Amino acid sequence: LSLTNSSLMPTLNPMIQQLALAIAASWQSLPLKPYQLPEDLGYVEGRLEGEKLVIENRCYQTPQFRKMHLELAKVGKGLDILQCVMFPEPLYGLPLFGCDIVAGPGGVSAAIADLSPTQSDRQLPAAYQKSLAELGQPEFEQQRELPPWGEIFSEYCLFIRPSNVTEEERFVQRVVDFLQIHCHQSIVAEPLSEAQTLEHRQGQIHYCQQQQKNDKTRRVLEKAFGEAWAERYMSQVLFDVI
């Protein structure tokens, strides 16, 4: 989580850099252990007939978080990506923190962050609703509508093209606030009942299945590694169904 050894970090979009730092800072003092990705994946790079894709994977776990995944990626010189999901241990019934940032030479094109539900009612737990409302509605000038598979995201989901530096910083601060709420609720959460654990597990499986419908992610992977590799990466590395 010291991103000091990262090859990609110094060359990434500035908003991406600040988000990577914020997420690493949030995780740094947790009771972390490594989480071994399939084939103990770390750094990976590939090219077929076009641009090369490079990805740095970092992945941890704690008793409350089954898998805490931070990816940084670059396609050629034209495209920077940050991806993060904290997959909850269903026993504690926490939502899914997720973030995806895509940037090119012109700036950030997509900034997405959410605390996504795992309950069957598609609602966040009550304490998250209370804490999230207290943050107030952020104003962003260029909102983007989620694609249909995006039904998985909560009403607090951000999906924007930041308009300027003030918006970039506003977005990063909102992600820090979501992380602050989430890490706090993780301390105050109890082991749930076996039926409740099952209901949360089902929500998390649904979230992964829907995230696999994201053809924007899939095409980037396919252009660098091919269809089979991208299928294995999406289903086994990014959005593994437990």
Ligand X SMILES: C=CC1=C(C)/C(=C/c2[nH]c(/C=C3N=C(/C=C4\NC(=O)C(C)=C4C=C)C(C)=C\3CCC(=O)O)c(CCC(=O)O)c2C)NC1=O
Tokens of 85: 């999901």
Tokens of 226: 């091919």
Residue by residue, DSSP assigns 122-171 as S---HHHHHHHHTT-----SSB-PPPGGGGGS-TT-EEE---SHHHHHHH
Q: Which is nearer to ligand X, 1 or 84 (CB)?
A: 84
Kindly state the smallest distance separating residue 182's Cβ from ligand X, in Å: 13
Tokens of 213: 């419908």
Q: Which residue is nearest to ligand X (CB)?
A: 98
Kindly state the smallest distance separating residue 85's Cβ from ligand X, in Å: 5
Q: CA 127, CA 136: separation in Å to the nearest integer?
A: 15
Kindly state the smallest distance separating residue 157's Cβ from ligand X, in Å: 8
What is the bridge-based pairing of β-strands 43-46 and 53-61?
A: antiparallel
**Binding footprint of ligand X on the chain (CB under 6 A):** 55, 71, 73, 81, 83, 85, 98-100, 102, 109-110, 112, 114, 146-147, 150, 159, 214, 216-217, 220-221
Tokens of 55: 């990805």
Q: Which is nearer to ligand X, 42 or 191 (CB)?
A: 42
Kindly state the smallest distance separating residue 143's Cβ from ligand X, in Å: 12
Q: Which is nearer to ligand X, 49 or 191 (CB)?
A: 49
Kindly state the smallest distance separating residue 233's Cβ from ligand X, in Å: 7
Q: CA 196, CA 90: separation in Å to the nearest integer?
A: 8
Q: Which is nearer to ligand X, 71 or 168 (CB)?
A: 71
Q: Which is nearer to ligand X, 196 or 214 (CB)?
A: 214
Q: CA 196, CA 92: separation in Å to the nearest integer?
A: 9
